[PDB]
Design a binder for this molecule. Sequence first.
Ligand code: MG
Ligand code: MG
Length: 349
Amino acid sequence: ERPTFYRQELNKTIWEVPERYQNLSPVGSGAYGSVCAAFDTKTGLRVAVKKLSRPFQSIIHAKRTYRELRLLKHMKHENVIGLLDVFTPARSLEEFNDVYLVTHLMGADLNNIVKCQKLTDDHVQFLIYQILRGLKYIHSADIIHRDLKPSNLAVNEDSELKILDFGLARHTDDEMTGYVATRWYRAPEIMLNWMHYNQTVDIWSVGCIMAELLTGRTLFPGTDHIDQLKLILRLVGTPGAELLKKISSESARNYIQSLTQMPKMNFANVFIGANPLAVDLLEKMLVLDSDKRITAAQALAHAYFAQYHDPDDEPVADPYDQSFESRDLLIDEWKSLTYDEVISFVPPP
Ligand SMILES: [Mg+2]
Ligand SMILES: [Mg+2]
């Protein structure tokens, strides 16, 4: 029951896909692969078809391909991007070389929509609510997004939102250098590798996003890692003795101690005119000590979301086994694992 594939030269490369996918139009390409928008005749949906580039060129890339596939296959939630289809023109493992991932084509991201723009409080409540709803689900599976930012949040005409572009491969040092949005939303503990981070880094990101939706401005637009740290400490105050101890690196800890101490600012005087409940939530999310930040599940129960919160309609995820992350395998082994995941894929209802 293998579909019939047809070939077409797109993105300077040959694309071989099932007949169901029509009107392929290149819309982007990265170091990870090329993407084409298409019309899926089987579902009637507009979709993004991503052809990975040399998915098995090294152990690192092979494991990354496997990682991304396992992750997309697991995500089954309204506010998270899921996998509509995955296919390969290969008819056997020996012939297996290419991987195509198919997902919902999302109109645009939060970035290309609210850029230099301030949204109403009701609008912010709905958007942040959906992000936290997707995040409760994600974290419940012990998965950390690690790269939440406006450009990784898709929204349709009805303001329905989906989280995407999970952190699969560590960004390059150059990618996080300077006045770049790629770093403005990162929690300080991970921006400067202070300690073994956890799911709480994602809540810091939500806080930065939320503040930007409310003000129309980037909360911490640092020109470099240090400038950014100063912008952050200026708002939330410098680390106390309790947090200092939790910082593994002696170097980091030592640099921190060189800074003049500063008290946490009054957020009501920072986010002027903002809903007091919004201010309160921001203070709970933008906490320097990650151990003390509010969790997604806790945040959903915060009064700011009274209008949308429904404890019976904020599902958690099935257990997600990521023991493979510690597996030491050869390229071909990662490739065979990916192959099994491709052929065992079951279309969503
Ligand atoms: Mg992205
Ligand atoms: Mg519903």
